[PDB]
Amino acid sequence: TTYTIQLTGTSSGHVYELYHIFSGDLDANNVLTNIEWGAGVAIGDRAKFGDASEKAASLSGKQNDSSEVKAFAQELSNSLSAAGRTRVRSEQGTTTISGLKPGYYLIKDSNGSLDNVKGQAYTSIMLQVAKDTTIAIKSDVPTLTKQVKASNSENYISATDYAIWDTVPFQITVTLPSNYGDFSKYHFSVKDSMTSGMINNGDIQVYLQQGGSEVAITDSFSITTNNGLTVSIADLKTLPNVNENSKIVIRYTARLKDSATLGTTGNSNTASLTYSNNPNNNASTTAQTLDSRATVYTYRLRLTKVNERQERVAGAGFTLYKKINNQYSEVRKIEASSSSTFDFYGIKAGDYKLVESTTPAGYNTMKDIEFTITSTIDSTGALTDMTSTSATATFETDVNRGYINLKVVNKQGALLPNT
Numbered sequence: 045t046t047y048t049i050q051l052t053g054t055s056s057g058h059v060y061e062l063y064h065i066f067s068g069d070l071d072a073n074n075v076l077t078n079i080e081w082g083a084g085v086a087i088g089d090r091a092k093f094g095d096a097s098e099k100a101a102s103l104s105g106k107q108n109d110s111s112e113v114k115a116f117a118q119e120l121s122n123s124l125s126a127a128g129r130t131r132v133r134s135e136q137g138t139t140t141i142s143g144l145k146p147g148y149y150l151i152k153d154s155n156g157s158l159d160n161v162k163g164q165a166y167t168s169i170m171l172q173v174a175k176d177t178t179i180a181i182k183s184d185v186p187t188l189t190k191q192v193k194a195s196n197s198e199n200y201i202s203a204t205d206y207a208i209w210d211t212v213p214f215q216i217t218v219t220l221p222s223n224y225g226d227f228s229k230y231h232f233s234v235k236d237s238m239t240s241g242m243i244n245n246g247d248i249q250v251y252l253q254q255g256g257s258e259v260a261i262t263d264s265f266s267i268t269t270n271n272g273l274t275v276s277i278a279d280l281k282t283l284p285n286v287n288e289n290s291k292i293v294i295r296y297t298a299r300l301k302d303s304a305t306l307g308t309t310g311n312s313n314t315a316s317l318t319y320s321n322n323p324n325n326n327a328s329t330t331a332q333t334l335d336s337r338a339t340v341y342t343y344r345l346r347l348t349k350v351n352e353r354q355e356r357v358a359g360a361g362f363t364l365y366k367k368i369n370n371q372y373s374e375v376r377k378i379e380a381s382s383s384s385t386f387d388f389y390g391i392k393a394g395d396y397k398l399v400e401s402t403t404p405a406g407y408n409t410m411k412d413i414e415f416t417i418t419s420t421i422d423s424t425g426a427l428t429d430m431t432s433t434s435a436t437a438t439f440e441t442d443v444n445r446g447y448i449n450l451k452v453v454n455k456q457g458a459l460l461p462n463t
C-alpha cells in the first residue's frame with residue numbers, strides 16, 4: 045500500500061525533499077500502528093530520540109502547529125539521511141508526490157536551492173502523515189507595493205501627474221508572510237531608488253497597520269541615504285505587536301525639480317524588500333522582492349509672445365491660475381523681462397486660467413484664456429495621451445516630449461482718423 049501527499053500553493057523552480065521519518069500501518073482514521081524508524085533518520089541519530097513507537101506515542105493527539113511537533117521537526121532536520129529521501133521538482137500551484145511508503149514524512153526545500161532567487165523562500169519544515177490528502181505548503185513571501193497618491197483623489201495608484209507647486213505623497217505597503225510566526229528573527233530592509241527628477245522632503249515615517257489603525261514605529265528603523273533610501277531594522281521580531289497579519293507602511297513626500305522628465309518617459313522610482321527567506325534552524329539568509337515601480341508625469345507649458353509682424357516681443361508677464369472649485373487661485377507668476385518666451389515648467393491635468401498681468405508697451409491686453417489639460421493614463425501606469433484645449437485659444441502639443449506651446453499674438457491699438 046502506498047500514499048500521496050499533495051502540496052497546494054507551491055511555486056515553480058523548487059525541489060522539495062521528503063524524508064521518511066516513521067514507517068507503520070495507516071488505518072482509515074489515519075492512526076499509525078507498528079511504528080519503526082524510517083530510512084530518513086540517520087541510524088546514528090536515532091538513539092537521541094529513543095524508541096520510535098514511544099516517540100510517536102508521545103506526540104499522539106497533539107495539535108498540528110503545537111510547540112512539541114515543531115521542536116521535533118527542527119531536531120529531525122539535523123538528523124536526516126538520503127537513504128529515506130524522495131526529491132520532487134515543484135510545479136506552480138499544486139505539486140503531487142505519490143507512491144510513498146506508509147508513515148510520517150518531513151518536508152523541506154533542498155539546501156541552497158533558492159539562494160539569491162528573488163520572491164521565493166524556504167518552506168517551514170513540515171511533518172505529514174502520507175494519507176492521500178492535500179495540504180497547503182507552509183511557505184510564503186512578503187510583498188512590497190510602491191504607490192503614489194492620485195493627483196485628483198485620496199486613493200493611491202501606480203502612476204499619476206503632478207505640478208511643480210504640488211507635494212507628491214508616496215506610500216510603500218509591505219505584507220508579511222503567513223509563516224512569520226515560525227521565524228525566531230526577521231531581517232527587514234526596504235530599499236527605494238528615489239526619483240531622479242525629484243527632491244525627497246525627508247519626512248519619512250513608518251507605520252504598523254492592522255485592525256483599521258496605525259501606530260508610528262519610525263524610531264525603531266534605521267533610515268539612510270548612502271545606498272538609495274533604505275529603511276531597515278535588524279530584527280522585526282523586536283517589535284512585539286508585529287505578526288503575520290501586520291502591514292508595514294512607509295510614507296514620504298517629494299517635489300518635482302524644474303529639470304524633471306517631461307512627457308511619456310516620466311519620473312519613476314523602484315523599491316524592493318530584503319527579507320529573511322528561511323525560518324528553519326535560525327538561518328540568516330535573505331532574499332529580495334521584485335521591484336515595484338511608481339511613476340510621476342509632468343508637462344511644460346510654454347508661451348511665445350509675438351506680434352502681427354511675426355516679431356518676438358518682450359515686456360509681457362503672465363500669471364497662471366488653477367481652478368480648485370469655482371475659485372481660481374494663483375500658482376505661478378512670471379514678471380516682465382527682456383524675454384519673449386515663458387516656461388511654466390511642471391504642470392498637470394486640470395483647469396487653468398492664464399492672465400497677461402503685464403502687457404508690453406503699445407499693444408492691447410489679451411483677454412484671459414481659460415483652458416483645460418487632460419492626462420490619459422492606462423491601467424499599466426503608462427501615459428497614453430495628453431491634451432490642452434480652450435474655448436478662445438489653440439495649443440500645440442507633443443505628448444512624447446510633454447510640451448504644451450501657446451503663441452500669444454500682440455495686436456497694436458487703433459490710430460483713429462479725425463474729421
Ligand code: NA
Pocket residue numbers: 053054055058181183
Ligand atoms: Na513554494
